[PDB]
Amino acid sequence: TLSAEERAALERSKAIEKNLKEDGISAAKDVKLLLLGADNSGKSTIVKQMKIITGIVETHFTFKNLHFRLFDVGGQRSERKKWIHCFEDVTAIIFCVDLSDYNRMHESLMLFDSICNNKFFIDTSIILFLNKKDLFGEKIKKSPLTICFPEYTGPNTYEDAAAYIQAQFESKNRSPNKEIYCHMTCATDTNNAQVIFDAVTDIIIANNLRGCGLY
Amino acid sequence: STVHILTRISQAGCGVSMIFLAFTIILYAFLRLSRERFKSEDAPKIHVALGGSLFLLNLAFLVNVGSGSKGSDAACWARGAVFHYFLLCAFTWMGLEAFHLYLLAVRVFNTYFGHYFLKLSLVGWGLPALMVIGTGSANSYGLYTIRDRENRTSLELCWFREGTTMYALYITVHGYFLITFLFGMVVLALVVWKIFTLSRATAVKERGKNRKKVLTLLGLSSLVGVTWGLAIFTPLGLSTVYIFALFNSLQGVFICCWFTILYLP
Amino acid sequence: ELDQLRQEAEQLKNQIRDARKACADATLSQITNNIDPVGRIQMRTRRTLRGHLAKIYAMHWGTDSRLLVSASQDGKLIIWDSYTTNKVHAIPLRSSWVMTCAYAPSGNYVACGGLDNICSIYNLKTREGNVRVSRELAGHTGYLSCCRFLDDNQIVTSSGDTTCALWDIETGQQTTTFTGHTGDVMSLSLAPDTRLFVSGACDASAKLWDVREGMCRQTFTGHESDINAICFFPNGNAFATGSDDATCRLFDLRADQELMTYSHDNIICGITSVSFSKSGRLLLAGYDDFNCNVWDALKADRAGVLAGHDNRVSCLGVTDDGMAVATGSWDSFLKIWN
Amino acid sequence: ASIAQARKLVEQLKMEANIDRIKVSKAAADLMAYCEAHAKEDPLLTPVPASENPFR
Ligand SMILES: CC(C)CCC[C@@H](C)[C@H]1CC[C@H]2[C@@H]3CC=C4C[C@@H](OC(=O)CCC(=O)O)CC[C@]4(C)[C@H]3CC[C@]12C
Ligand SMILES: CC(C)CCC[C@@H](C)[C@H]1CC[C@H]2[C@@H]3CC=C4C[C@@H](O)CC[C@]4(C)[C@H]3CC[C@]12C
Ligand SMILES: CC(C)CCC[C@@H](C)[C@H]1CC[C@H]2[C@@H]3CC=C4C[C@@H](O)CC[C@]4(C)[C@H]3CC[C@]12C
Ligand SMILES: C[C@H]1C[C@H]2[C@@H]3CCC4=CC(=O)C=C[C@]4(C)[C@@]3(Cl)[C@@H](O)C[C@]2(C)[C@@]1(O)C(=O)CO
Ligand SMILES: CCCCCCCCCCCCCCCC(=O)O
Ligand SMILES: CCCCCCCCCCCCCCCC(=O)O
Ligand SMILES: *C(=O)CCCCCCCCCCCCCCC
Numbered sequence: 001t002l003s004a005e006e007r008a009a010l011e012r013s014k015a016i017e018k019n020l021k022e023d024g025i026s027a028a029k030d031v032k033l034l035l036l037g038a039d040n041s042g043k044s045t046i047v048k049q050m051k052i053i054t055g056i057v058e059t060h061f062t063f064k065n066l067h068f069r070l071f072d073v074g075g076q077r078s079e080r081k082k083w084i085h086c087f088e089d090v091t092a093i094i095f096c097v098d099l100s101d102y103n104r105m106h107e108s109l110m111l112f113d114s115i116c117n118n119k120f121f122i123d124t125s126i127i128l129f130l131n132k133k134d135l136f137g138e139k140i141k142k143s144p145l146t147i148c149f150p151e152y153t154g155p156n157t158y159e160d161a162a163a164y165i166q167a168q169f170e171s172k173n174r175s176p177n178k179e180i181y182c183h184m185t186c187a188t189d190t191n192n193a194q195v196i197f198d199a200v201t202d203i204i205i206a207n208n209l210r211g212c213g214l215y
Numbered sequence: 216s217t218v219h220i221l222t223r224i225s226q227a228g229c230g231v232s233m234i235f236l237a238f239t240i241i242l243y244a245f246l247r248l249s250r251e252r253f254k255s256e257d258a259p260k261i262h263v264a265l266g267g268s269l270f271l272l273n274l275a276f277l278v279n280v281g282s283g284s285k286g287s288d289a290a291c292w293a294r295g296a297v298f299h300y301f302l303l304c305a306f307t308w309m310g311l312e313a314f315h316l317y318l319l320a321v322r323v324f325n326t327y328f329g330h331y332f333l334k335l336s337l338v339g340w341g342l343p344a345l346m347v348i349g350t351g352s353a354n355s356y357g358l359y360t361i362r363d364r365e366n367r368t369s370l371e372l373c374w375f376r377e378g379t380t381m382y383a384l385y386i387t388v389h390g391y392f393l394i395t396f397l398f399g400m401v402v403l404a405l406v407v408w409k410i411f412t413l414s415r416a417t418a419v420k421e422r423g424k425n426r427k428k429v430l431t432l433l434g435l436s437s438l439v440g441v442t443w444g445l446a447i448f449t450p451l452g453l454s455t456v457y458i459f460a461l462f463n464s465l466q467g468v469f470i471c472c473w474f475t476i477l478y479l480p
Numbered sequence: 481e482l483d484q485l486r487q488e489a490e491q492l493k494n495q496i497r498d499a500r501k502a503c504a505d506a507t508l509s510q511i512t513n514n515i516d517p518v519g520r521i522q523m524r525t526r527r528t529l530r531g532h533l534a535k536i537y538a539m540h541w542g543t544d545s546r547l548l549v550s551a552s553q554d555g556k557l558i559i560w561d562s563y564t565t566n567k568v569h570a571i572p573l574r575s576s577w578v579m580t581c582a583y584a585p586s587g588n589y590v591a592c593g594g595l596d597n598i599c600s601i602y603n604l605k606t607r608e609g610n611v612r613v614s615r616e617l618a619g620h621t622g623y624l625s626c627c628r629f630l631d632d633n634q635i636v637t638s639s640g641d642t643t644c645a646l647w648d649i650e651t652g653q654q655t656t657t658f659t660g661h662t663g664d665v666m667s668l669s670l671a672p673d674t675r676l677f678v679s680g681a682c683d684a685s686a687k688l689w690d691v692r693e694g695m696c697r698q699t700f701t702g703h704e705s706d707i708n709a710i711c712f713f714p715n716g717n718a719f720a721t722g723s724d725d726a727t728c729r730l731f732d733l734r735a736d737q738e739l740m741t742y743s744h745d746n747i748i749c750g751i752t753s754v755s756f757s758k759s760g761r762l763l764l765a766g767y768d769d770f771n772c773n774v775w776d777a778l779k780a781d782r783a784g785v786l787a788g789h790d791n792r793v794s795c796l797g798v799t800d801d802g803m804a805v806a807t808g809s810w811d812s813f814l815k816i817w818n
Numbered sequence: 819a820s821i822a823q824a825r826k827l828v829e830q831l832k833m834e835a836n837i838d839r840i841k842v843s844k845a846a847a848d849l850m851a852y853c854e855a856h857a858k859e860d861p862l863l864t865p866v867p868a869s870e871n872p873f874r
Contacts, residue, residue: 016567024533055596078622078640198416208319213477214428504842511846526873715852735845759856761863802861818873
């Protein structure tokens with residue numbers, strides 16, 4: 001710390017430390033959202049204005065002076081258990097589900113089962129969407145909800161079927177201290193950035209109130 | 216000799232609180248040394264600073280009660296000034312912890328300010344400094360006798376002196392407690408309102424988790440407030456020293472167990 | 481026609497297994513019992529290199545035994561100076577999701593890659609004061625799990641598409657492709673003479689590869705679970721591996737079979753990294769219980785433990801001259817032990 | 819179909835089959851020899867005093 005070369009070295013160390021602190025405060029104000037879900041469930045247009053930007057795909061829409069970063073981890077086609085711990089630092093797991101389909105329903109349910117009970121994602125909250133509600137309400141009349149869920153025998157109605165499906169999804173929690181902020185997006189005439197905003201705010205408030213002992 | 220009883224009981228309760236707050240300070244030093252990443256958290260700093268403020272307040276109260284009615288006048292002039300300073304420090308630290316709760320549960324996003332704990336500590340240790348400087352500029356400290364309806368000296372202390380007008384005492388102790396309690400209750404009301412508004416937008420009305428956490432936080436904070444209100448506004452006579460010592464012991468133990476459960480996995 | 485080929489392959493693997501059983505006359509412990517063990521080894525945290533914001537996924541020592549690289553999910557590739565904890569560089573990564581870093585044996589280049597399926601090569605000895613992305617290598621269909629420079633002009637990288645590939649950093653295209661794995665390749669390790677290299681995959685098999693020939697030579701199967709870590713022996717005639725079964729195993733390139741196993745009942749966490757000492761007497765292995773056990777590579781006795789991290793210890797590397805051991809971790813604090 | 823990879827697999831397996839192997843005793847002896855011929859140059863195996871280690 002006396003010679004010229006060591007002095008210049010310490011100067012470079014300090015300039016780099018300052019840049020690191022600047023980027024560390026500039027990058028912590030974004031929200032990271034892991035975007036799971038079976039394919040063709042409208043996960044590519046969960047928000048109308050995303051401004052997107054094979055591996056992990058990013059989309060970075062902004063809303064109410066806050067930067068949301070959405071990572072679609074479909075397309076990796078590798079061992080999910082081997083790189084899923086990259087995303088242990090996300091705030092919430094968005095999870096789109098296509099209601100108008102019947103073959104992808106059990107795949108979606110099994111994927112949700114595997115995710116909601118992982119060891120890295122055991123306290124990360126889920127924001128479960130349910131896309132294409134109107135097409136479901138149109139299809140439910142012609143095809144009852146028994147060719148998809150045989151154990152179901154309640155009344156054949158839009159409301160009862162949708163509530164039963166949502167209950168079937170939410171019944172895989174198996175781990176309190178994590179809530180499933182469900183929602184039913186019509187996928188045609190909906191503006192659901194506010195749903196993400198409010199669910200994220202509640203997640204972060206719960207995260208902080210649990211940092212002050214509250215349990 | 217009621218002086219004996221009052222002195223001994225106040226001393227014992229104060230000492231138990233001192234023991235537990237010292238345990239808290241020691242455990243904070245151990246946690247800060249033995250673990251990285253604990254130096255950047257600011258909530259434990261606010262907690263340990265409030266604990267230390269209560270510890271020093273207890274120490275000042277012990278010094279006053281033990282050596283009352285003895286020494287020169289301008290000596291425990293400064294003694295009472297110090298005791299007032301530490302009382303106002305405890306109050307300002309409860310207020311600053313309410314403000315921290317405001318930053319965590321009302322304004323949730325973009326709450327990063329450089330030198331956060333520096334500014335908090337500056338406020339919490341230098342606002343009572345101005346208060347005491349002012350209060351002393353008028354020579355308001357001195358002896359303070361407690362009669363207990365008999366006009367007999369039940370306990371000699373040298374809190375604010377009796378000069379037929381107590382504007383200083385009420386404006387700078389009771390008024391400060393009320394201002395801080397009001398700030399705390401306003402912040403708690405804003406927290407409750409925000410939680411019960413979000414409980415409608417997320418469509419999870421009853422199941423919501425925060426609807427219970429915030430009610431528990433309110434039920435504890437209002438208790439912590441009303442117990443200090445009862446401590447201040449009621450006069451320290453006989454048959455009410457036991458309750459005060461017990462309140463102090465519990466105010467110590469709760470801080471100790473809260474800090475040792477929150478920061479030991 | 482298919483079934484008879486299956487029977488022929490089964491008979492061939494039986495012949496291989498019986499040959500390996502016939503070559504095994506005495507166990508390694510039976511030979512090394514008469515050696516006096518190492519005393520208790522207590523290493524102390526000399527330095528602590530802080531400055532990373534997110535978890536640290538890979539580090540790598542320089543050949544000059546002084547500088548080391550670190551990569552983290554915060555998107556920063558820092559090139560430290562371990563002597564005076566002096567950040568020589570900090571390169572901003574284009575992709576925040578990186579799982580490996582490499583440091584050329586000349587000290588002039590640094591490589592990085594991860595979930596973006598690309599191995600970028602960052603120059604260091606530029607004329608001006610800058611570190612520009614020299615050449616991006618994109619020929620894989622899966623995340624890159626490891627990379628290792630041969631020269632400052634050739635790099636061999638593994639990936640999650642089950643195939644390793646030797647590149648030509650000057651051109652930008654694969655010069656060879658090493659295929660034959662079933663699961664995806666998780667780690668590789670270069671030989672001291674940089675002519676061979678081993679590789680572990682999630683099919684619980686470690687295969688020896690020939691660089692110039694592009695063909696596989698041998699294969700080893702002792703583990704049950706995935707293989708995360710692999711490291712050659714200092715003389716290039718053995719290697720140890722790490723697995724999620726909480727055991728490390730020493731394999732041999734001549735006897736063609738496992739020589740010894742490193743297990744303990746109090747250990748049920750998966751090995752995250754392995755590395756040898758300068759003479760090969762110590763076998764370091766970073767675990768998931770946040771500790772870093774230092775094994776006795778000839779006695780299988782747990783010599784010492786380096787418990788200094790609060791989260792999982794992800795990377796681990798012994799200095800090229802055997803001076804220190806730098807164990808990165810997920811709590812973002814590298815530590816130099818000695 | 820899978821017959822192509824079947825031929826490739828049986829070819830690689832037969833190629834790996836006919837290789838030269840030695841006894842485990844010899845291999846263990848060589849590991850012993852290497853671990854005992856470089857024991858004096860192991861700064862982690864045998865500690866060095868604080869006057870030599872650059873990370874003192
Ligand atoms: C953020 C910073 C700038 C706040 C600074 C506050 C102080 C500079 C002022 C604000 C309220 C004032 C106090 C209001 C009234 C009193 C009571 C007064 O008591 C008396 O002895 C005079 C009246 C009486 O004796 O009856 C002495 C001054 C004091 C403490 C004042 C002191 C000076 C204070 C603390
Ligand atoms: C009565 C007024 C005028 C003077 C008061 C002097 C003493 C009692 C006051 C004034 C400054 C105060 C200190 C300010 C800073 C610190 C450092 C902190 O980490 C512990 C509290 C501590 C140590 C305070 C203790 C009480 C203190 C020393
Ligand atoms: C005696 C005069 C100055 C009045 C008293 C002023 C003192 C008590 C005030 C003014 C500046 C304040 C300090 C400002 C900065 C820090 C550094 C922080 O890490 C701990 C609190 C601490 C140490 C504060 C303690 C209280 C403080 C020292
Ligand atoms: C918790 C603190 C707060 C102290 C009071 C501050 C206000 C005061 C002003 C007065 O009018 C008369 C006396 C009191 C009410 C005080 Cl000084 C004493 O009675 C002792 C108390 C409770 C305390 O020190 C104890 O711990 C109990 O022993
Ligand atoms: C009578 C001897 C001195 C007794 C001091 C007891 C402790 C009082 C202050 C407690 C800690 C102050 C705030 C801590 C802030 C920090 O940790 O940086
Ligand atoms: C009246 C007692 C409680 C007083 C506490 C309320 C005021 C606290 C002020 C602390 C400042 C914290 C950092 C401010 C950052 C900023 O807004 O620029
Ligand atoms: C989170 O950071 C910790 C919050 C714990 C509760 C905070 C209490 C807020 C209001 C305290 C005021 C109570 C009455 C004050 C009497 C002077």
